[PDB]
Write a protein that binds this DNA or RNA. Structure first.
Length: 86
RNA sequence: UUGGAGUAGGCCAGCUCAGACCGAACUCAUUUCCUGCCUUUUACCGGAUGUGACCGUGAGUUGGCCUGAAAUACUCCCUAAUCUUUGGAAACUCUCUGGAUAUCCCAGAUU
């Protein structure tokens, strides 16, 4: 309501896209469907991208950004580095 | 915190088991002796020794009755602020050790 989590409520009240950086080094782009005080959120229309360096024949290749589309998302709170309300 | 299997109280009757304290109470009969009183024995005296009955008792279980309650209700066991549950992670490089041993790779350790 009046705390920081209200922006997630503002994410609920507007259904806007949100960019989430996670402690695994990956990034999420999703619309916030539900949240709580414990920052456990449920998301819809989810597109998750990350960066990996493929090692081909023992040589470290260039970093490639790839992605995956997930319809329904249950992201757990403590792994989130940071949340950006776009 | 939940699931599974359960269903009340009162009373009546049958059955089984329980004296050891079944019974915080108390009689009678009788076998074999010993004693007493005794003309005879029933009835008696009072100790031992066993052995039966009778007045009662409890638990378990089965059926029934009475008043209800009516999927209500009750029941048993059971499964975000530091020491765990609201993550010091993630990622990569360097060095060292071993295998390979010209390297790549990988395991372990460390930053």
């Amino acid at each position: 309501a009046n705390g920081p989590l209200s922006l997630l409520q503002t994410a609920v009240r507007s259904h806007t896209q949100v960019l989430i950086s996670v402690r695994s080094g990956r990034k999420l782009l999703a619309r916030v469907k539900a949240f709580d005080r414990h920052c456990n959120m449920i998301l819809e229309n989810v597109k998750e991208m990350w960066t990996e360096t493929p090692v081909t024949n023992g040589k470290k290749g260039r970093p490639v950004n790839k992605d995956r589309f997930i319809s329904k998302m249950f992201l757990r709170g403590d792994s989130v580095v940071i949340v950006l309300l776009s």
